[PDB]
């Protein structure tokens, strides 16, 4: 991911991934970017999540972090899950990745990436963090999602771990 002097660096390089279950959920790396301008070049040329057909997912993780649970950074990590009604995921994905890339979560390097999963009758937004036992980070991320995605007060969210 070459970077020019005129463009605005991100705190981390990030990598877009894409997966679809085909009658099979194998994740495919799209590409890596390093600046805000580079991000928009990818995102503005990607179909919106809500316009994806079938069992499809977009992943946006820091370069070098694999969006699977075999990765070491994820063995001790967790993720917040928001199961949305259809029609909301595209805007939540954008707001989420803007805040993640913008470093508005304020949790050091704890963030691994974000995932939007398009399913038959629901969409699933999630964000992964390094250490699941870090109750301090898990709580900040939750409150941040609430404000950043403009979730109604009673919105249901789940934090899943691997243990």
């Amino acid at each position: 991911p070459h970077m020019l002097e005129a463009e605005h660096p991100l705190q981390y390089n990030y990598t877009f991934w894409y997966s679809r279950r085909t009658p099979e959920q194998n994740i495919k790396q799209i590409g890596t970017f390093a600046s805000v301008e580079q991000f928009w070049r990818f995102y503005s040329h990607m179909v919106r999540p809500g316009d994806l057909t079938g069992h499809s997912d977009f992943h946006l993780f820091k370069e070098g972090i694999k969006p699977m649970w075999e990765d070491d950074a994820n063995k001790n990590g967790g993720k917040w899950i928001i199961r949305l009604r259809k029609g909301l995921a595209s805007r939540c994905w954008e707001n989420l990745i803007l805040a993640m890339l913008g470093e508005q979560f304020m949790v050091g390097e704890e963030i691994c990436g974000a995932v939007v999963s398009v399913r038959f009758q629901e969409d699933i937004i999630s964000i992964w963090n390094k250490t699941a036992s870090d109750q301090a980070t898990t709580a900040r991320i939750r409150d941040t999602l609430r404000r950043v995605l403009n979730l109604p007060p009673n919105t249901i969210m789940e934090y899943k771990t691997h243990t």
């Binding site: 605005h8 660096p9 991100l10 705190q11 894409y18 679809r20 495919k28 799209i30 590409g31 805000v36 301008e37 928009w40 070049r41 990818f42 503005s44 040329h45 990607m46 179909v47 919106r48 994806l52 057909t53 499809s56 977009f58 928001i82 199961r83 949305l84 009604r85 259809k86 029609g87 909301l88 595209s90 805007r91 954008e94 707001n95 803007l98 805040a99 890339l101 913008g102 470093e103 508005q104 304020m106 050091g108 390097e109 009758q121 629901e122 969409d123 403009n150 979730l151 109604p152 919105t155 249901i156």
Partner: protein, 69 residues
């Protein structure tokens, strides 16, 4: 730890520019299902509909997840 590169929402959006040049990575054949040829402006610039406003204001969870609670 503190971040050295920070961009608020408006800053991220301020830096969007319509660039018809598609990143070569996205011209791979296996990404044809997700390729958007004509660049799209951020959804942030699209106003809410009446439905979007109601949903984001009152209820966003799927019926499936509400079926468990």
């Amino acid at each position: 730890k503190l971040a050295d590169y920070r961009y608020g929402r408006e800053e991220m959006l301020a830096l969007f520019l319509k660039d018809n040049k598609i990143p070569s990575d996205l011209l791979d054949k296996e990404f044809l299902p997700i390729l958007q040829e004509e660049p799209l402006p951020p959804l942030a610039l699209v106003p809410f509909t009446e439905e979007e406003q109601r949903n984001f204001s009152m209820s966003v969870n799927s019926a499936a997840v509400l079926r468990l609670t």
